[PDB]
Paper text:
[name] is an α-maltose 1-phosphate:(1→4)-α-d-glucan 4-α-d-maltosyltransferase (starch synthase (maltosyl-transferring), EC 2.4.99.16) and a member of the carbohydrate-active enzymes database (CAZy) GH13_3 family. It is the third and defining enzyme of the four-step [name] pathway that is responsible for the biosynthesis of a branched α-glucan. The key contribution that [name] makes is to preferentially extend A chains, limiting the opportunity for GlgB to introduce a second branch into B and C chains. The enzyme consists of five domains, four of which are typical of the α-amylase family.
In an attempt to obtain a structure of a trapped maltosyl-enzyme intermediate with an acceptor bound in a productive conformation, we soaked a crystal of the [name] variant of [name] in both malto-octaose and 2-deoxy-2-fluoro-α-maltosyl fluoride. Fortuitously, this yielded a structure where malto-octaose was bound such that it occupied both the donor and cyclodextrin binding sites, whereas the donor analogue was unexpectedly absent from the crystal. This structure would therefore appear to represent a product-bound species with subsites −2 to +6 occupied. The two sugar residues in the donor site are oriented in a manner similar to those observed with maltose and α-maltose 1-phosphate. The residues occupying subsites +3 to +6 overlap with those seen in cyclodextrins and the maltopentaose described above but are somewhat displaced to allow the product to bind in the appropriate orientation. The conformation of the oligosaccharide was unusually flat and extended compared with amylose or amylopectin, which have α-1,4 torsion angles closer to that of maltose (ϕ = 116° and ψ = −118°). This was particularly striking at the linkage where the donor and acceptor glucose residues occupying subsites −1 and +1 connect (ϕ = 34° and ψ = −157°), giving the longest distance between the 2- and 3′-hydroxyl oxygens of 4.9 Å. The product-bound structures of the [name] variant of [name] had an additional malto-oligosaccharide bound at a secondary site located on domain C. In each case, five glucose residues were well resolved, clearly showing that they that were wrapped around Tyr-646 of [name] [name].
Author numbering:
A (entry chain A), B (entry chain B): 15 to 663
Amino acid sequence: PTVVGRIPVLDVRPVVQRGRRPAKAVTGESFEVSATVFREGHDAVGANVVLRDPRGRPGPWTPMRELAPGTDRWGATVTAGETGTWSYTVEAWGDPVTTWRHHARIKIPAGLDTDLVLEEGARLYERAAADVPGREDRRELLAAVDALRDESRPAASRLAAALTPQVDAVLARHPLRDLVTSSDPLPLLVERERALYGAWYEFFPRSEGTPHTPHGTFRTAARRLPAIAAMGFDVVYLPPIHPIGTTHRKGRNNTLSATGDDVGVPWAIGSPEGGHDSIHPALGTLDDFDHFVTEAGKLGLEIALDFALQCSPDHPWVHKHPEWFHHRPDGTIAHAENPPKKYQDIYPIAFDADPDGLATETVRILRHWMDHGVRIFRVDNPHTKPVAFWERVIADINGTDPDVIFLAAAFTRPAMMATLAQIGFQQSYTYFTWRNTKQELTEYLTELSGEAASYMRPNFFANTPDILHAYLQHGGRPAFEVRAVLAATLSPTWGIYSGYELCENTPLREGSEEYLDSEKYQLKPRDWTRAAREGTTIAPLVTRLNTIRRENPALRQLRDLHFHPTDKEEVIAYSKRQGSNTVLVVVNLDPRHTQEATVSLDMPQLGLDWHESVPVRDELTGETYHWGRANYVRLEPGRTPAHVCTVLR
Amino acid sequence: PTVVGRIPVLDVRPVVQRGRRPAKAVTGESFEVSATVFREGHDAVGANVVLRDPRGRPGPWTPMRELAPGTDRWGATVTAGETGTWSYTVEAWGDPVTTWRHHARIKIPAGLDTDLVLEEGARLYERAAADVPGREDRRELLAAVDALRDESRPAASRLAAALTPQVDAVLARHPLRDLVTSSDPLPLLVERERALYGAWYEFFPRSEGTPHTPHGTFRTAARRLPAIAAMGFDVVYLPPIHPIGTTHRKGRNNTLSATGDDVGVPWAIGSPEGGHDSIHPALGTLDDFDHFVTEAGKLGLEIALDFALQCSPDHPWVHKHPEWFHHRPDGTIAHAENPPKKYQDIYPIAFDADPDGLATETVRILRHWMDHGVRIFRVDNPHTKPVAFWERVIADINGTDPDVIFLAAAFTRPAMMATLAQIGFQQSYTYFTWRNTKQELTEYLTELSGEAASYMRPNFFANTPDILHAYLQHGGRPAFEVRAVLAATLSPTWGIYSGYELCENTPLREGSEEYLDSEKYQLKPRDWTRAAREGTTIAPLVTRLNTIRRENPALRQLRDLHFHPTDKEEVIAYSKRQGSNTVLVVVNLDPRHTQEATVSLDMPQLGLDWHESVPVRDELTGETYHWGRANYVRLEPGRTPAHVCTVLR
Ligand SMILES: OC[C@H]1O[C@H](O[C@H]2[C@H](O)[C@@H](O)[C@@H](O[C@H]3[C@H](O)[C@@H](O)[C@@H](O[C@H]4[C@H](O)[C@@H](O)[C@@H](O[C@H]5[C@H](O)[C@@H](O)[C@@H](O[C@H]6[C@H](O)[C@@H](O)[C@@H](O[C@H]7[C@H](O)[C@@H](O)[C@@H](O[C@H]8[C@H](O)[C@@H](O)[C@@H](O)O[C@@H]8CO)O[C@@H]7CO)O[C@@H]6CO)O[C@@H]5CO)O[C@@H]4CO)O[C@@H]3CO)O[C@@H]2CO)[C@H](O)[C@@H](O)[C@@H]1O
Ligand SMILES: OC[C@H]1O[C@H](O[C@H]2[C@H](O)[C@@H](O)[C@@H](O[C@H]3[C@H](O)[C@@H](O)[C@@H](O[C@H]4[C@H](O)[C@@H](O)[C@@H](O[C@H]5[C@H](O)[C@@H](O)[C@@H](O[C@H]6[C@H](O)[C@@H](O)[C@@H](O[C@H]7[C@H](O)[C@@H](O)[C@@H](O[C@H]8[C@H](O)[C@@H](O)[C@@H](O)O[C@@H]8CO)O[C@@H]7CO)O[C@@H]6CO)O[C@@H]5CO)O[C@@H]4CO)O[C@@H]3CO)O[C@@H]2CO)[C@H](O)[C@@H](O)[C@@H]1O
Ligand SMILES: OC[C@H]1O[C@H](O[C@H]2[C@H](O)[C@@H](O)[C@@H](O[C@H]3[C@H](O)[C@@H](O)[C@@H](O[C@H]4[C@H](O)[C@@H](O)[C@@H](O[C@H]5[C@H](O)[C@@H](O)[C@@H](O)O[C@@H]5CO)O[C@@H]4CO)O[C@@H]3CO)O[C@@H]2CO)[C@H](O)[C@@H](O)[C@@H]1O
Ligand SMILES: OC[C@H]1O[C@H](O[C@H]2[C@H](O)[C@@H](O)[C@@H](O[C@H]3[C@H](O)[C@@H](O)[C@@H](O[C@H]4[C@H](O)[C@@H](O)[C@@H](O[C@H]5[C@H](O)[C@@H](O)[C@@H](O)O[C@@H]5CO)O[C@@H]4CO)O[C@@H]3CO)O[C@@H]2CO)[C@H](O)[C@@H](O)[C@@H]1O
């Protein structure tokens, strides 16, 4: 054998860990398959992509084209259908017909060996007619052959009866392919839509209580579901819903000692009342939780539970499974860390005494919540448990229930982030919150929509309970408006944590990214009705952004994204496309000062002529503009954070 | 079974075609094995490279280090030994001792759990002690244990007894590795020194004739070998030495019809007198060729024959193997093309009718010349024959005779260039002659000495019989000096085509890269004795450059190469190192004007202090300067084309 085939087809992308892990897509998503294709000598090559479904059935005729001249890099867009494990192949081939046309264009006019050239022609077109399975098509070609060999017609007459648009059509569909050479198949995992596209809202059920009973239940917190659905959200992420430990319970504002009333941190999971398969008694029963899930579902909301593989000192596991913890010479267990942060209320799990026991128990727990309608898990600190443990766990869960989605909350270095996504995590948190300037956003979104999109699906939370960026702190409401526009338009999945709507931005101290009086360590009742009444919420903008995403397919995908130059540091501009839907966004990143700029659009990228003018509608205002290659914009913080425009087609 | 191991070790490099083709090296050559290595949580990792020889014998302990902070990318240098197929593997592991130290360096001056910390170290050093081979080493580790355990001593002195330089050495040589995890082995092909390092000289034997017999023989051409070996060359590249066709034979200066005594083009191989297994009858007999080869060897020169797989119309193959050519509808064979260069004197070979017979015959022809001591083949136009043909042919020949070296004369696009080298070509012609400015040289050499060094070895011909670059046309002798120093010092393999010495630079016409009165179409007698008598030759400089190369191991390798800044655009600087040998080179690229500039060196990159001084010797002159951080140079065309300095230590 030989590594290289007759016509070289090499370095097929996408590829993840050299073929050992699947590339990713979701139902309905288009992406580029590419390859290096070329041949010996000067004759033309062609190439096509053969995408195959889980039962092995090939997709449609999908020809490729060289992506830039002289590079020998070929590409074509493919689209994924039903969920499951697909494969894709690039077929490369000599294209004698393009070759002969190239020569027949020059030699026939300038006079050289004409009878010979046309007869070389007729034999190609005759070989073309055999592989063609339709009879009306086949006759269209045998007409060109007889016209090529008809020596009573002059030279340019016999030539041009082979170069009609009528014949182009047949050969564009069934071309003559020499020396078909095939790459080895690469794997593609196609998952459900929600893996890539959705809006997420995080809240603490315990905060939504009553005057007589401050600690909310599932029954009381259900009253927020209608409002969350009215904002356009699809997923509700709940922090841990299990009993909370008492030993070393943290107090308000992350203090070491709890008072009597203090509720502790949901992440300090476990007490005598139960562990990860239990409900905090103050939240209600498993029955109340089913009713919450049922109400959520009737409003089009899925529930995502936090899975945090750690324990308070009171978790049953501490006595039932001591071997799942590292003990020091004196018997004690070191509390968890993530420096310079210390988690004095919890123990980390050790995996090397009993990995099998731990995988078995973990998938048992997940299967429990899956039985009760939870098909999404937000996995806490996955980067502090082994990578292979998650690879096993996710493989096991998806083996039986491929619809389950796991989101890696991996705020960590790039290698681990990438690796977690590559071993099966459906979505990932990202560096979004720490990308605020134009350069930062452009660089990073260029990275996420590029190569990374074959293994990572980003979830852009503009805030979290642990992340209030200095941009939001210093810039106030105009800043919240900017980051929501940015989050919802740059990623097909975005989210907020309750209170973002109210522009809560008081930090614990200057230089921190923690909230003052954080909800992690206390009940936090909010006057939602008063904020609506007095207009001190951005819930309308949030609602509007989700409607725009729901109405424009371009915003429900990731990979088609392009940045257009403006002439101000503070004004950034980008576009996204999907079929006939084009969305064009311009954002002022200055939350204190009005900016005016000229956005110089890159018209070929919008599928347009440079000299063209096209109507757009700002979906944030309903106002219509006429824009082309060079457009004045004026953006005033408070009043207009951005223009979010559809191209009227 | 998980793809990912316990301690992730990922994306091991070098790698060629995803592990389906070997990376390359030569005996004595050092290169970097790298990998992405990290683990879950905050604890430290270590890693090492296990290079295995062709019998499986592992190499020495070879620990890696993180190459830049926060990247998780680790590397170490390895050195290839005897020839054959080797393998390499990266081992990654938990480094508990480093982890304990970082925790203890903090927790002991604090006072936080000191008896408990020091017992944890004692127990680690106990484990470390068990795995050590040496008696003296195990005693040193068990001493540090008792010092850690001695509760009557203060905390800082118990710890200090485990942090000594004496213990550090033991553990760096024999460390305690948790959870050892291995990459899958990658293949390395190790070839003879000559594949990477050597000086090449091309000449046409027929031009070394007599007054009474103008057409040179192998007997007369042997008398040119001593001057070639005195110039310090290692290889003699001869154009095709076979009989030459008469049908469509070309005349002088590439005209279509030859006169009665025109000698034709050597590459138009074949007459009734023989094919690629025969000697041109004007060159002598097979026996004369053996005498020639022997005379070459006696002077330390190896012979490289041109292998051009093509035919004159009079080549026996035309009638014997008709299926080895492409025939038009009238039975005529179209002459070869490489547009706009027409080759009217030859036919190209077609490969898809009888590939087995073509391969069989090609290896037979190659084996014939190998029986007569030809161990190197300069393969003409490899990019016009199928890639898989050369893969097959090279695999065949190297399977019995691994010392045979194939050099790819592929002046073509990047993707084919690279692919040829990756499928087995030991050496590759390059874009060197079209890289004349500082920006061009730096960019290209950065490319050739980085990632492509794992599959391609460059041969820098400053000229060929097809390439007289304008730099040399417009530059005169000073330009010949510049390009010779550049070629000899930037690649461990370089060469020249005869006449380069004499500063032959008249082109066929303005804007061509062909020689006037090109030696391809005529006898080109050269009065070597006269040019030496008169000094109209750079043979002294050539001798000197090769001698410098023979005495500085830095110039006999490719991959260690760094460029240092200068403030003139016309002056380029670079260093190369190998063990304790370091060669600094500064070249004036201006052939017409005298140039002065400040060379600002990158002193860390030479293994030196920023505030350091170092004695250098320009080996071109014998002069000695004292250079440091910033250095004045004055380079005068004619007198001083460059400085080629060594570092005296
Ligand atoms: O009851 C228990 C418990 O409950 C709660 O706690 C829980 C939380 O509620 C829960 O959500 C969860 O949160 C924790 C989370 O899981 C942890 O991972 C942890 O994350 C935080 C980090 O600890 C913290 O440091 C920070 O980190 C982020 C940085 O601040 C950002 O700036 C950002 O940094 C990344 C860069 O953006 C990115 O570019 C890349 O950087 C690389 C560079 O590009 C590259 O050049 C190179 O840099 C070099 C330089 O070039 C060189 O010159 C020189 O300076 O070195 C550098 C590098 O050393 O390399 C760079 C890579 O290193 O990557 C950067 C990533 O490092 O992102 C950082 C990470 O996202 O914020 C994190 C998020 O908050 O802590 C979370 C909070 O606890 O789990 C908790 C436990 O269950 C309560 O809160 C508790 O009180 C309670 O006890
Ligand atoms: O008896 C028979 C016969 O005998 C003799 O002939 C024989 C000879 O004696 C023998 O030695 C042998 O020689 C021939 C050789 O084998 C042939 O291949 C042929 O080679 C010559 C070429 O025909 C000729 O064109 C030329 O080519 C070189 C260029 O001049 C250089 O400029 C250089 O170009 C390369 C670039 O340097 C490099 O960067 C790369 O460029 C790519 C870019 O990097 C990339 O960005 C992209 O560019 C885009 C741009 O982005 C875009 O904006 C826009 O501009 O488009 C471009 C792309 O179009 O892509 C670029 C390309 O992919 O590659 C460039 C080249 O591809 O290098 C060129 C090649 O090295 O010189 C060649 C060397 O001579 O001809 C030789 C001579 O015949 O075999 C002969 C046959 O046996 C006698 O001589 C005969 O008379 C006799 O009949
Ligand atoms: O298209 C979306 C846009 O629609 C509406 O804009 C209209 C404007 O309200 C209206 O005034 C008009 O725009 C005129 C503008 O009135 C006029 O003054 C002139 O603008 C000048 C600035 O006055 C001048 O300071 C300077 O400003 C920038 C410059 O743009 C920038 O390129 C760089 O050089 O810095 C300068 C200083 O910061 O130059 C500009 C012109 O380049 O010309 C404008 C041309 O139209 O008409 C607009 C509709 O066509 C909405 O009001 C607005 O909110 C929406 O964004
Ligand atoms: O190191 C290799 C070098 O060694 C020997 O050079 C020595 C000289 O022979 C010796 O005279 C001395 O050099 C003096 C120089 O004579 C003196 O004129 C001065 O040079 C000035 C220039 O006059 C001035 O035009 C300017 O030149 C450059 C500048 O360097 C550059 O950075 C940029 O700004 O462009 C300018 C315009 O061309 O500045 C320089 C000084 O920076 O000072 C020199 C100080 O050394 O010492 C030399 C070192 O030993 C050999 O003789 C010589 O052949 C070798 O090349």
